[PDB]
Scaffold this active site. Sequence first.
Site, mmCIF file in Angstrom:
data_model
loop_
_atom_site.group_PDB
_atom_site.id
_atom_site.type_symbol
_atom_site.label_atom_id
_atom_site.label_comp_id
_atom_site.label_asym_id
_atom_site.label_seq_id
_atom_site.Cartn_x
_atom_site.Cartn_y
_atom_site.Cartn_z
ATOM 1 N N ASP A 52 -12.151 6.591 -0.384
ATOM 2 C CA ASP A 52 -10.779 6.670 0.141
ATOM 3 C C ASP A 52 -10.416 8.106 0.552
ATOM 4 O O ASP A 52 -10.082 8.950 -0.296
ATOM 5 C CB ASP A 52 -9.738 6.125 -0.882
ATOM 6 C CG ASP A 52 -8.250 6.073 -0.309
ATOM 7 O OD1 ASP A 52 -8.125 6.187 0.883
ATOM 8 O OD2 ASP A 52 -7.313 5.934 -1.073
ATOM 9 N N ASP A 68 0.859 -1.160 0.000
ATOM 10 C CA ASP A 68 0.000 0.000 0.000
ATOM 11 C C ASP A 68 0.913 1.233 0.000
ATOM 12 O O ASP A 68 1.549 1.522 1.018
ATOM 13 C CB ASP A 68 -0.919 -0.037 1.245
ATOM 14 C CG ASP A 68 -1.927 1.073 1.366
ATOM 15 O OD1 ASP A 68 -1.972 2.035 0.589
ATOM 16 O OD2 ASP A 68 -2.650 1.099 2.163
ATOM 17 N N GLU A 74 -6.122 0.921 -6.202
ATOM 18 C CA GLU A 74 -6.375 0.981 -4.759
ATOM 19 C C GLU A 74 -7.781 0.474 -4.384
ATOM 20 O O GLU A 74 -7.877 -0.368 -3.480
ATOM 21 C CB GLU A 74 -6.116 2.426 -4.216
ATOM 22 C CG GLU A 74 -6.269 2.581 -2.654
ATOM 23 C CD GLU A 74 -5.928 3.969 -2.011
ATOM 24 O OE1 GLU A 74 -5.750 4.866 -2.546
ATOM 25 O OE2 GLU A 74 -5.912 4.100 -0.925
ATOM 26 N N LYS A 116 4.327 10.440 -5.234
ATOM 27 C CA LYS A 116 3.335 10.087 -6.234
ATOM 28 C C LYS A 116 2.779 11.249 -6.996
ATOM 29 O O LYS A 116 2.170 11.057 -8.042
ATOM 30 C CB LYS A 116 2.180 9.320 -5.670
ATOM 31 C CG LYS A 116 2.531 7.968 -5.232
ATOM 32 C CD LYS A 116 1.314 7.125 -5.110
ATOM 33 C CE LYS A 116 0.367 7.650 -4.103
ATOM 34 N NZ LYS A 116 -0.669 6.687 -3.838
HETATM 35 N N1 LIG Z 1 -6.410 6.006 14.097
HETATM 36 C C1 LIG Z 1 -6.663 7.053 13.313
HETATM 37 N N2 LIG Z 1 -7.727 7.918 13.518
HETATM 38 C C2 LIG Z 1 -7.952 9.011 12.684
HETATM 39 N N3 LIG Z 1 -7.123 9.305 11.590
HETATM 40 C C3 LIG Z 1 -6.015 8.471 11.308
HETATM 41 C C4 LIG Z 1 -5.735 7.289 12.166
HETATM 42 N N4 LIG Z 1 -4.650 6.663 11.691
HETATM 43 C C5 LIG Z 1 -4.228 7.357 10.604
HETATM 44 N N5 LIG Z 1 -5.046 8.452 10.361
HETATM 45 C C6 LIG Z 1 -4.923 9.465 9.262
HETATM 46 O O1 LIG Z 1 -5.122 8.764 8.035
HETATM 47 C C7 LIG Z 1 -4.288 9.283 7.003
HETATM 48 C C8 LIG Z 1 -3.498 8.087 6.419
HETATM 49 O O2 LIG Z 1 -3.858 7.848 4.996
HETATM 50 P P1 LIG Z 1 -3.691 6.397 4.269
HETATM 51 O O3 LIG Z 1 -4.657 5.572 5.087
HETATM 52 O O4 LIG Z 1 -2.285 6.041 4.175
HETATM 53 O O5 LIG Z 1 -4.255 6.608 2.772
HETATM 54 P P2 LIG Z 1 -3.540 6.923 1.395
HETATM 55 O O6 LIG Z 1 -2.295 6.093 1.420
HETATM 56 O O7 LIG Z 1 -4.506 6.538 0.247
HETATM 57 O O8 LIG Z 1 -3.228 8.417 1.432
HETATM 58 C C9 LIG Z 1 -3.495 10.445 7.628
HETATM 59 O O9 LIG Z 1 -4.211 11.675 7.296
HETATM 60 C C10 LIG Z 1 -3.539 10.133 9.133
HETATM 61 O O10 LIG Z 1 -3.356 11.256 10.026
#
Ligand SMILES: Nc1ncnc2c1ncn2[C@@H]1O[C@H](COP(=O)(O)OP(=O)(O)O)[C@@H](O)[C@H]1O
Lengths: 379, 327
Positions: A196, A7, A172, A68
């Site tokens: 997403d 991922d 994705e 990216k």
């Molecule tokens: N436990 C949580 N609760 C709320 N927000 C979270 C938590 N864990 C991660 N995040 C948030 O999720 C985001 C991570 O994105 P991700 O899931 O990697 O998606 P992508 O890779 O498509 O951008 C960040 O903005 C981060 O601060």
Amino acid sequence: AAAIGIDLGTTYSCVGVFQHGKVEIIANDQGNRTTPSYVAFTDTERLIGDAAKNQVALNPQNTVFDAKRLIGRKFGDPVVQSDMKHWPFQVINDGDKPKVQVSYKGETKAFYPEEISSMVLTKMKEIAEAYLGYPVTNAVITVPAYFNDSQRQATKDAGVIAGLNVLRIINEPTAAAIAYGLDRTGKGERNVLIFDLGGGTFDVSILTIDDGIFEVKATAGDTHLGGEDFDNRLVNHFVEEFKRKHKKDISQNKRAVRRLRTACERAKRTLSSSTQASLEIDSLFEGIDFYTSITRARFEELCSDLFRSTLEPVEKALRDAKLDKAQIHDLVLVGGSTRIPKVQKLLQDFFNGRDLNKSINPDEAVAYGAAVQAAILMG
Amino acid sequence: DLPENKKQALKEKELGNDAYKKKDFDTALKHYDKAKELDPTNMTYITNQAAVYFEKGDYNKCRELCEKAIEVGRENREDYRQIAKAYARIGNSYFKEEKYKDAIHFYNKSLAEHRTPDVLKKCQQAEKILKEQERLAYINPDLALEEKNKGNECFQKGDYPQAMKHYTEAIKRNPKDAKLYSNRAACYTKLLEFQLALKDCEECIQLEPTFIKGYTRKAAALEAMKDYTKAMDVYQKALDLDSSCKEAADGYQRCMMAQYNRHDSPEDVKRRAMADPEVQQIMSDPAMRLILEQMQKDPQALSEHLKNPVIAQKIQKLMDVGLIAIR
Ligand SMILES: Nc1ncnc2c1ncn2[C@@H]1O[C@H](COP(=O)(O)OP(=O)(O)O)[C@@H](O)[C@H]1O
């Protein structure tokens, strides 16, 4: 060697492995299943992951993220030209292809976005290898559904540089659908909307699944909406309070802002569970310690429009797919930001109480799905 | 079957319905207001009151009511089609006030709730109307002249693709500029896009039937494509306007010989002639197939059948394209 799936995001990444009948999500050395898509070129080492994220405080001009956004693009591409204006690192024109310039061990160097990505993938490879006890080359890497051909090949090449046998590139949302078992319906069903809400972007798409065959009918999204701007609203809240208490505006102090912003992210995560979070930073500005708080309700108010705006791409995707709400059989949450109760509430209201599919952590589901497909390709 | 207040709301709903059948807007509102209070978790009373306000032209009130109904239906998990209807009606108020851009916004919401065939058609009408309004707003003959003039500067240098781009902006800005259509036609003829030369020349000509140049540009494209029969006819139309015209006379004379000299192999004739739907129809029609067989076998069948224009002109067309040769 067990197949893995990776991922690969703009701010975060995660690797899953399929072994002994199931997918395991592998935590890195800091205990994080999801680790930052950061590379820090320090004057002593090339750090990757949390080791790199924690250096943004010290060498921000030499750290990179958002690879990216540059991968697969021409230097003169309007996206490149716009996005570079908001970064601490320099984007360089090398054959009309952006290359990113940092200073490493005191030397001027520049790496293609693909190289930066391969560094991240190498780290994910190391995480998986250390976990499993052996080298792993068999991998599946996911990409956003809106990627073009140059972008998918560029992603694959980053894997090649890392030393992976890239078995496949998967959009994705397909990976998420796999993770949730939507390829096991045995029917011409289902029409699934995958939402997403990620780090720096918001990607909404509708996949129609027919007995294991996937088609993307529609995409919608916002390239400058994700979790980062929720954190930005949170920063402004805390800066304004600091200012009122000390008659000092700290938004112009880059070190104060990076530390505040990091704390803001932590507060946002805290609030996805609790209704209260503390802000605790020593020497935030001019030696001033800044201690304060925010509640869930306050956070939602600061970000009330950001949350509402996530539904506009939903309406767009439904229209482009020529589907109504009634025709969506399932709703899938992807992205750590979907863990915020406000997001979940908006989707349930938008969809009239339909349950959201949370059986797999939203920020693991893509790695998970990639690991499943990788397992299939290898067995 | 129903809670007493639901049944009471229903009795009032039904009386309200009869009042509307008779166009008794106000008696009906009274019945629906009672019904609304009796069973508040039901959009139907709210949307019916809105129906009055829409018919009365009171679009702001009917919009408030539709919006309330939508919020209520979602809270109470009412059918997505009910929500859609409330949105469709909102779009209808804007449609009726000619605010098509807003009608569309609300119809889009209606479609998301349910892609109701009525909304699909009504929103298409809203789009057609708005699109025409936008083109008319876009049109500005002075901007068309500036783009036309830049297109001409490019054209005159041999840069036909750039000229074409500027001519395109000029036509969006001034749609009746016949001269502009023929200037694009020229770009295409020079670039061997002979087909496109024909379509822009034809619009030029209908706009300005005396524009001899529209005809010479069209005919040149036809001659170049070895369509000498139509090129000659187009050049002749140009001669009808001015018998002294050089391309009209010279292209005409070249076509006059070339239209026969090119026949060569029958494969050229079949590929070119059968491109034309008129001869495809002549050949696909079995009546003509039977007539043609008699004609091959008996010159007198030709003598007699050709006395009737319905056949004589089907045959004339096949001869004109070179499919039927007469010795
Ligand atoms: N436990 C949580 N609760 C709320 N927000 C979270 C938590 N864990 C991660 N995040 C948030 O999720 C985001 C991570 O994105 P991700 O899931 O990697 O998606 P992508 O890779 O498509 O951008 C960040 O903005 C981060 O601060």
